[PDB]
Write a protein that binds this ligand. Sequence first.
Ligand code: CA
Ligand code: CA
Ligand code: CA
Length: 316
Amino acid sequence: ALRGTVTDFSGFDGEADAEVLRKAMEGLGTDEDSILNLLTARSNAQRQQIAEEFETLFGRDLVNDMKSELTGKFEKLIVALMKPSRLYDAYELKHALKGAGTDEKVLTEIIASRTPEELRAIKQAYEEEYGSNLEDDVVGDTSGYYQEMLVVLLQANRDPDTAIDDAQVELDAQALFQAGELKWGTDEEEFITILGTRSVSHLRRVFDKYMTISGFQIEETIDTSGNLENLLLAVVKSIRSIPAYLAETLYYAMKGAGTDDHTLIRVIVSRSEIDLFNIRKEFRKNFATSLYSMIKGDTSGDYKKALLLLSGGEDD
Ligand SMILES: [Ca+2]
Ligand SMILES: [Ca+2]
Ligand SMILES: [Ca+2]
């Protein structure tokens, strides 16, 4: 059901691939086309192998060469594509942890939308790479019940789908309606436990029960909102549908004045092998154009070409 848009290339020769990229860059001048045609059509594990082979051939590090050879957004994209899947979310989290200038958007997006499995892998990749504990660094660079919600979620311990108890559904719906009357400023532990810990299917029932109880959907309570409110929205939307949430994220990365390339790159690279196909379907369903068409319009050059190759779905 969950389908990315990049898969293992058939008849893969890592050595041949290394020589293509070498021909593309050796000398003054650069063949961005050959580079982006190659790497956007190889899976991430194949890219790591291509990098290995490149080093043995040329004696040179592949990513460093592409850092000097390439420029701007296109460089940032290619270098993102070269990060191993296993470390990519751990890296984007580190990049976003900066004490005062901490990038909450990224923390929220990743933690609210990743599965239990994905979180404990991220938590392990993060300690190996950076020699510190993800939860502690998060705690040290965040505050309030935003921090609390995050730590809870980082416990990667959500309830599994079981049999539905409508009485319990009645109570939580009632508890979240009341928490929302109090503007998410009281007994925060309670609604954190409900939203951060109860099962996916339980909570989808809760959202409907809530709408009966209140007249409005739970999203309409939150949206000029704080960090904690953005997290509740991200968690709620991720509960309803992860690809929808991530389609929405892509949309706002582009809808305004310029482009939030940081987000565009991250969502495409990190989702390219999990559920980007599903993301395209939600984006078309909910925003009335292909994801392809919005990339085409908001991006240019080789950067755009690579992004469209990764994504696909022109005739969506
Ligand atoms: Ca060159
Ligand atoms: Ca980043
Ligand atoms: Ca724009």
